[PDB]
Amino acid sequence: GCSTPLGMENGKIENKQITASSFKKSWWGDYWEPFRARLNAQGRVNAWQAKANNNKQWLEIDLLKIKKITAIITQGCKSLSSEMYVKSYTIHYSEQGVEWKPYRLKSSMVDKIFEGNTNTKGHVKNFFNPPIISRFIRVIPKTWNQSITLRLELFGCDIY
Numbered sequence: 001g002c003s004t005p006l007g008m009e010n011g012k013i014e015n016k017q018i019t020a021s022s023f024k025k026s027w028w029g030d031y032w033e034p035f036r037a038r039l040n041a042q043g044r045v046n047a048w049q050a051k052a053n054n055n056k057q058w059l060e061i062d063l064l065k066i067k068k069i070t071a072i073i074t075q076g077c078k079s080l081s082s083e084m085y086v087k088s089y090t091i092h093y094s095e096q097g098v099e100w101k102p103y104r105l106k107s108s109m110v111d112k113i114f115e116g117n118t119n120t121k122g123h124v125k126n127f128f129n130p131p132i133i134s135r136f137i138r139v140i141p142k143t144w145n146q147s148i149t150l151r152l153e154l155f156g157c158d159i160y
Contacts, residue, residue, distance in 0.1 A: 022051035
């Protein structure tokens with residue numbers, strides 16, 4: 001089958017493979033680095049937080065080789081007295097990491113907007129019908145509650 005978690009939570013996807021447009025750095029050593037965006041992560045800093053909340057943000061995952069990506073799970077983050085989570089997002093993909101292509105349905109001309117989270121720890125899973133075949137995946141937050149924060153996991157399999 002093709003529904004195996006690709007490695008965000010279990011750490012098979014290494015820190016070096018996860019990057020972002022920007023990330024929050026607190027005056028006192030709290031860096032919400034991209035690679036902290038792992039499903040179910042706990043800790044003082046357990047998620048990626050964009051440096052600024054605007055339409056120019058993205059979290060990128062380099063799978064190191066082209067794979068078939070069948071689903072994605074996103075989760076939010078509760079930090080202090082603040083509930084932050086991405087409510088909707090689009091997906092961009094690439095085989096080379098140079099040219100980016102937006103995920104769109106067959107009878108579509110606009111980017112497919114995926115429904116995201118409605119709380120901080122609940123898992124929201126979205127299936128890609130059809131699957132995405134690529135090496136790089138970018139999650140583009142469209143709407144968020146309070147602040148852009150994410151914890152995620154990707155599911156797929158190798159190409160044969």
